[PDB]
Design a protein around this ligand. Structure first.
Ligand code: HEM
Ligand SMILES: [C-]#N
Length: 222
């Protein structure tokens, strides 16, 4: 079985749970305002910054290298523009860094620094979603908050260096399937993807609440 299929099958259940989380249900209802959208995007800024920083560190490591597509995929630059749009010129010291965001970042650094063979689990969870369902989220955001079709404020959901996200996603899947894979890695990667999904749900549920030792559970634990 291909890694791309294993990951899809292993995360289909938690995905349904994530899209039905309180925050996401509200989002899909067009009930999230500027305040809430800013919190999520600011958090993603931190998350992608750590994610892509770890990707850089391991770009020449075979366990991830085949998926090194910064020009087409990386979102940090886009999020920086979005932060300027939503938070202004001095967004740097204005954006929040929530407990759930902090712990997501913490796991990303552990993976990138200690278990790089699992980095693909995290890139899959975020990027492949961005390239697909993220396009639906983009439409919801535009309609709800009156964001122009030109893209300002939604650079994160826009991929200027790709002709068709659906097409690129197919390519990414195929390259994911070239990574050296053994039962050990496969088992662990699919398990880490579930954790990645959970870290996202914890974030979104933490933000929802804000809007309304190693074994110690995360502060934003469900
Ligand atoms: C408002 C809630 C959400 C909506 C509307 C949504 C919807 C979708 C849709 C329509 C697809 C494409 C399925 C297809 O036709 O093949 C998709 C794929 C995906 N989504 Fe989401 N999604 C949501 C939340 C999330 C979250 C929170 C994550 C985790 C960061 C996520 C990660 C993914 C991944 C990794 C894929 C790619 C699946 C694959 O092809 O292997 N999604 N999503
Ligand atoms: C899914 N995004």
């Amino acid at each position: 079985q291909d890694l791309s299929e294993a990951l899809k099958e292993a995360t289909k259940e938690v995905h349904i749970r994530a899209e039905n989380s309180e925050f996401m249900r509200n989002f899909q209802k067009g009930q999230v305002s500027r305040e809430g959208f800013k919190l999520v995007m600011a958090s993603l800024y931190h998350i992608y910054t750590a994610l892509e920083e770890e990707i850089e560190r391991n770009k020449q490591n075979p366990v991830y290298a085949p998926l090194y597509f910064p020009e087409e995929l990386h979102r940090r630059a886009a999020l920086e523009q979005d932060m300027a749009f939503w938070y202004g010129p001095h967004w740097q010291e204005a954006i929040p860094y929530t407990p759930a965001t902090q712990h997501y970042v913490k796991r990303l650094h552990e993976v990138g620094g200690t278990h790089p063979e699992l980095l693909v689990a995290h890139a899959y969870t975020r990027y492949l979603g961005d390239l697909s369902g993220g396009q639906v989220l983009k439409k919801i955001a535009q309609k709800a908050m009156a964001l122009p079709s030109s893209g300002e404020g939604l650079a994160f959901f826009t991929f200027p260096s790709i002709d068709n996200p659906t097409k690129f996603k197919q390519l990414y899947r195929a390259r994911m399937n070239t990574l050296e894979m053994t039962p050990e890695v496969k088992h662990r990667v699919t398990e880490e993807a579930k954790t990645a999904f959970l870290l996202n749900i914890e974030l979104f549920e933490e933000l929802q609440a804000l809007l309304t030792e190693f074994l110690r559970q995360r502060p934003a634990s469900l």
